[PDB]
């Protein structure tokens, strides 16, 4: 690719300008090594109207830099240009089109703020009056002047003396001061909108804590809801799978789930090679669900049919009591099928031997699979007539 | 109209007087060319009452100004000549009677600042000892510690000197220092307030944006989402039309609904002509829907009849597989009409060729417009039976 | 009423205590004429346990103060006779028991801060040196130190200058300019908080505004939706009938019904004298409705039968066209209940000429109604036979 | 247990390096004491690894610390023995797994203040001149200025006046000044997040509490609600069973719901002996509820039959009119279950004389269980024909 590397260098350039155009307005003995390189850097600004595929790029691109420092002309006419800082708020948003959005929009606020205060630093040196300084130390002084004023610490040791410089101290105050907030205020709200499933997830605990305790719950259960919560974030980073969905349309969702989703499908026997359409037709009525350990899911006699699709963890089976427990199962199986298939209630209970996450398909949604494909029909209803003994 | 230039200049004169009068009250030396206009604006004060179509505006009418300057009455009851102040908390009301109104309440909270500040100066100059200064001097050292006392800078070159003065800057500590704050971070909610369509629409797609990555999703269709979230606000601004209308009444929804849905009425043959009352009882019915390019809508053989109207994009209807295309369809026509015509299963596949935009309505109150029309119910029977070949 | 008076000298001598006890501590000259006052308040502080019908009122009744005064104990030990502050914190809600209480937590908020200044300000005094200065400006000195400390503008016109100091101002800086910010906050927050309902309906209609004007809309529509929320607003506040009783019980949510609809019930004829159990029975499916100027309430010949109970307005009956029109109704009266008298669609058109305010009952309600009741449902069966040319 | 002192020991020797390493760094004159208690910090801290039930660990176990110290290695290199510091972040999640989490979460983010400040304290000491002072007077001038410096005062009394000490003051400025205000902030946000269930039913009862009175509502149901809405507080503390269920999964939501409905259960004399799965099957179905006093529950003679499990209370049953009142019923005892045993309306009026909290289920899961199982059907069949006198 090469529009990563362009639009790099653009940026680059756009700094390179609005770094140097202010301090070269205030010295004036620059523009003499520095007039090839800005040269270069204006033959790629003006190279970037053909590679379009609005108006602050087509007034950036116009020379008056270049023309104001080489007729040395008088300073309300130079003062204007400045219009090649006008691709700064051009490229922010054309440099978005590429990490984190917040954490770009989080940068994007530091190096305003540097050139701001770059900007106003400099823009108070040229109002002090003819000093026999360096430059180092004069643009030192400027810069810790400017720092001062924005972060509203006000320490007076150097302050304004002509009228000149109090007003343009009151300018700096009203709008620069204000400002400053502004974007601080701004950082601080998206770098607390960084990694906001963990700021929920852990709001959601606490709310459920408090209340668990003001009614006094015994430690083996309180200690219980913990385990789960910690399990259920460490495996899922506290994201639910619906409210996300919602938004997106009917075929989108599908293709989303389509991938999901990858896991169960091709892994139980009756899922790959089962066709294309049926599984298009199952995929968005299956539910994650996590049971916990020694936590029963059958009870041997209700009415009603959910078919549990094991995707990891590992099942109990067990009769009415222990009696010789039937048998176990593990991932890639199924259960709780041959209630719907015999029109018969529940026969064995069903207890988890560990953290097992699994899916739930609801009774509609598989008597109407029976009585549309026949293929899965025969084989559940072989499955569950084998399975008898 | 008229009501656009009075207000205009209502708001000219009340902002004239709240120039005026403290720097009147401070230099007694004015007064003596500024009379014809004080009393020009005066007679204008008193030109609103009967053009009524509260009390604030009867206090300011009455003209104590005029009153104290020309009397050159004892400062204690001449501060009372304020009165002509009240007009700006009935005016801007007054004049919000008529561009965005957070653009407006922006503009209002930058003024109100402006015209603080200059009161709080002005106050300042009163309390200092008599000094030959030029006006302008002595007004912009005032101006320059009331942007530093209320920004809460404090440089600390100038200070007060006296009790009374003590007092002063007390006062202004206390009650002028925490509003400027409030009315700062009013500016800054209102100036956030501002587009806040894109800021949802925005937000949406990054919280979406989040969860399919911590699931690894193919490039092919992590970037085929974006697309398609692109093309949805670059056609409808992130706006929904149902969250919009909820809160007004059925008359005014369905006088707004028969505005918005203005396209696709009287664009296909059967929508204009069909009467009033038609259209009138299926205007609410029809949902906007988008469909990406090569995505299916058909899928030519499971159960429901609904019917698209096309409004935008075209379709590349086929059958079970390619097979010899039957056709393509265009703007301003429909498809999937014949399952419910023919009591039938859908018998064609069709897909997008193009990010069509069209119109659904279901099954439900397709049905009931047959059993209530009989010229579209006609209609429908013979272009179905007509279209088979 | 007693209580009203009680809690307010209570009030009044906890504040005097707020504002004498560190004026005491710093200047040793009181406490000579101050006597018989502060064993008068000190008589009431012990004679309000017996009036109870927890711990921090306990402490204040006993009376450090009295003791380490008349003692001129040393400071240390003495520092500890602001016990009787203790009453402040006991005192802000027991006088809650009693105007908006928002309004009250605006007041209650500011106190607090003009004592808590005092408090500083008194403290610092007590720290400088032994000089001969008047008591006044001594104080003044401190408290405006105190102000700009705590406001942090920090003039630094008078700084620390002992490590006692040093320690003292460290202080204040870290716990005292962070406080008060928080309080600045919350005053700020529940202002806003105040009158919360124009607030919020003004949101709602600028949210509505926003979008009906990227669709362009026609100005004859534009401007009367305006109207109608206009009216709602100027009507009704803003406020909704559903979400505020949502959470009252069914009785409590009966008897405020029993009480907000009390003009259309014994208004109409039938509903004055119907009974008790009847119109408790109907009182709660009854909907405030608002139609518009010249706005279409029937269309004579569609479906089902919603009766409209007129509180204020009148509505303009009509036939299929004009073709001089049947009649008009008023306030107290009632129209489309024969539509499901009879068993027939609706027979004529119906038109609001003004801004109607209206009750509409439901067609379940009124056929339950009608086969609970017999008077009701003759009445309504001779008045629809009845009106019939 | 001893992971609750061993983590409490591992925070207190975290801060112990976290205040003393950098005391030494710009002090040499100590290492000369503190050398065997660093050595006995230095071997917990590397006597944690083994004790692992992830890289900041890792590195504060190398010991840099005794060996720049030994050393006098030159200052660029013994900057980098602050690696000591780097258990602060991983120690503060560590010791979380230990009261409330949003208490825990105020104290830390006070020491990380305390902390911070010292440091910046601690560093600006080090880039003064060599003067001949105490210690505790340059430390304390050093952490005056920071805490000025870092709560953006700026009173300037001591302002840096080195260009080296310019831009470390230009740093902690840009970077110290903004942090603070995010911590402030943060302190705020949860000293607010406190009691936040008292927060929520206050705002409940203002909302409702506002529009009870546009609306002007007798007094004596203006303060009827209140006492309803107090009770609740002050018998629920504004909690509802509901929402914070909603979460939970079935099985820890009926293990839940087995732990809180634990006095209804084993009161009644048909609850406790009725089984386990029974129990199992209705604890899920009845609701809480409250009525108040002299409030009508049924009135004798409606449709539906909903079963009143008394909690707590007493009901005050009656007939059509009072007539010699039926009898009166108590704690752990019901009412309303022949409406559905003998399929008959209501025959007895029931009024509450106290505030009454009782449980109802619904006529669905009733008919359920009597449909289920024989004992109790049997037992209430027989209680309901025994009633009827
Ligand atoms: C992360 C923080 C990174 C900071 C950048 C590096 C530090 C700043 C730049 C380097 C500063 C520097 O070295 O100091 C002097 C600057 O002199 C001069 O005229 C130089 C003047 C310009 C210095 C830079 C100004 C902008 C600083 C913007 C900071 C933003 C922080 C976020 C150079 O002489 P020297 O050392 O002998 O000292 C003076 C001598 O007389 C006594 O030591
Ligand atoms: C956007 C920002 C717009 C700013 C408005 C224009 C600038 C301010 C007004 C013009 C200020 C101005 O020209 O300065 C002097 C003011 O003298 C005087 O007595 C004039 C005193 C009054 C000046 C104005 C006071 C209020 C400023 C409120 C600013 C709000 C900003 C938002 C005039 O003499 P001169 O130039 O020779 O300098 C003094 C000489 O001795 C050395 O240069
Ligand atoms: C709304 C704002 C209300 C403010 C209250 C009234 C103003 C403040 C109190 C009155 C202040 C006052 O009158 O000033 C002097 C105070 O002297 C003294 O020792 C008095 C010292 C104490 C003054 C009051 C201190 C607390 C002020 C707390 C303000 C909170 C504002 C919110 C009295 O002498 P005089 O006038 O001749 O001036 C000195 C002379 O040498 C030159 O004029
Ligand atoms: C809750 C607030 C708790 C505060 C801690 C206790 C107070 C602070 C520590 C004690 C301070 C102290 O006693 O003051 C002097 C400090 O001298 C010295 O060199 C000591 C220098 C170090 C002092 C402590 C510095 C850090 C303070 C961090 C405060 C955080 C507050 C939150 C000791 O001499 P002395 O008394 O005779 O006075 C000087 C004499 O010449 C005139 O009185
Ligand atoms: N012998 C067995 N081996 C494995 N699984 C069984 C056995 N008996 C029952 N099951 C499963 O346990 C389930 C319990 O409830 P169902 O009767 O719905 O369906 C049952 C089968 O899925
Ligand atoms: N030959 C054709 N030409 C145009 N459209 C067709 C043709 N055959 C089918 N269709 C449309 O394709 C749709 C596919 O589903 P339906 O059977 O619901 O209704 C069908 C018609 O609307
Ligand atoms: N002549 C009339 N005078 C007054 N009201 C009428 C007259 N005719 C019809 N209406 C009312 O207008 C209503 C129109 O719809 P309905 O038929 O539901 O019930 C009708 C009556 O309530
Ligand atoms: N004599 C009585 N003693 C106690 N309780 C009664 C008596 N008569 C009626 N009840 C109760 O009052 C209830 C009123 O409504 P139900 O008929 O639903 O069921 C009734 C019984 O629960």
Same mark, same amino acid.
């Given at each position: 690719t090469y529009t990563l590397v362009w639009k790099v260098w653009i940026l680059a350039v756009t700094l390179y300008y609005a770094i140097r155009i202010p301090l070269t307005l205030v010295f004036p003995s620059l523009f003499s090594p520095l007039l090839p390189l800005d040269i270069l850097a204006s033959l790629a600004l003006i190279a970037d109207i053909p590679l379009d595929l609005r108006l602050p790029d087509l007034l950036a691109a116009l020379p008056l830099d270049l023309l104001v420092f080489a007729l040395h002309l008088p300073s309300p006419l130079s003062l204007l240009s400045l219009v090649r800082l006008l691709k700064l708020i051009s490229v922010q948003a054309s440099a978005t089109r590429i990490i984190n959005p917040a954490l770009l929009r989080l940068l994007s606020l530091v190096g305003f703020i540097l050139l701001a205060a770059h900007g106003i630093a400099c823009g108070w040196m040229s109002l002090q009056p003819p000093s026999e300084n360096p430059a180092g130390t004069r643009y030192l002084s400027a810069f810790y002047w400017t720092i001062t004023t924005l972060t509203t610490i006000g320490y007076?040791?150097? #302050?304004?003396? #002509?009228? #000149?410089?109090?007003?343009?101290?009151?300018?700096?105050?009203?709008?620069?001061?204000?400002?400053?907030?502004?974007?601080?205020?701004?950082?601080?709200?998206?770098?607390?909108?960084?990694?906001?499933?963990?700021?929920?997830?852990?709001?959601?605990?606490? +709310?459920?804590?408090?209340?668990?305790?003001?009614?006094?719950?015994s430690p083996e259960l309180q200690r219980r809801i913990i385990e789960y919560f910690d399990y259920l974030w460490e495996t899922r980073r506290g994201y639910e799978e619906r409210e996300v969905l919602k938004e997106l349309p009917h075929p989108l969702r599908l293709a989303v789930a389509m991938?999901?989703?990858?896991?169960?499908?091709?892994?139980?026997?009756?899922?790959?090679?089962?066709?294309?359409?049926?599984?298009?037709?199952?995929?968005?009525?299956?539910?994650?669900?996590?049971?916990?350990?020694?936590?029963?899911?059958?009870?041997?006699?209700?009415?009603?049919?959910?078919?549990?699709?094991?995707?990891?963890?590992?099942?109990?089976?067990?009769?009415?009591?222990?009696?010789?427990?039937?048998?176990?199962?593990?991932?890639?199986?199924?259960?709780?099928?041959?209630?719907?298939?015999?029109?018969?209630?529940?026969?064995?209970?069903?207890?988890?031997?560990?953290?097992?996450?699994?899916? +739930?398909?609801?009774?509609?949604?598989?008597? +109407?699979?029976?009585?549309?494909?026949?293929?899965?029909?025969?084989?559940?209803?072989?499955?569950?007539? +084998?399975?008898?003994?």
């Open positions: 007076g040791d150097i #302050t304004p003396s #002509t009228p #000149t410089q109090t007003v343009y101290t009151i300018v700096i105050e009203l709008l620069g001061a204000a400002m400053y907030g502004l974007v601080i205020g701004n950082i601080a709200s998206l770098v607390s909108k960084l990694d906001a499933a963990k700021l929920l997830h852990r709001e959601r605990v606490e +709310r459920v804590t408090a209340f668990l305790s003001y009614k006094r719950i991938e999901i989703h990858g896991d169960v499908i091709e892994k139980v026997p009756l899922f790959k090679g089962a066709g294309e359409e049926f599984i298009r037709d199952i995929i968005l009525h299956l539910e994650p669900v996590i049971y916990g350990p020694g936590e029963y899911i059958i009870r041997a006699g209700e009415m009603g049919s959910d078919v549990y699709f094991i995707n990891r963890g590992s099942v109990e089976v067990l009769s009415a009591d222990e009696k010789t427990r039937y048998a176990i199962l593990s991932e890639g199986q199924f259960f709780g099928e041959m209630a719907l298939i015999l029109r018969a209630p529940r026969t064995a209970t069903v207890r988890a031997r560990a953290f097992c996450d699994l899916y +739930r398909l609801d009774k509609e949604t598989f008597d +109407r699979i029976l009585s549309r494909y026949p293929e899965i029909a025969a084989q559940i209803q072989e499955l569950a007539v +084998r399975r008898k003994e």
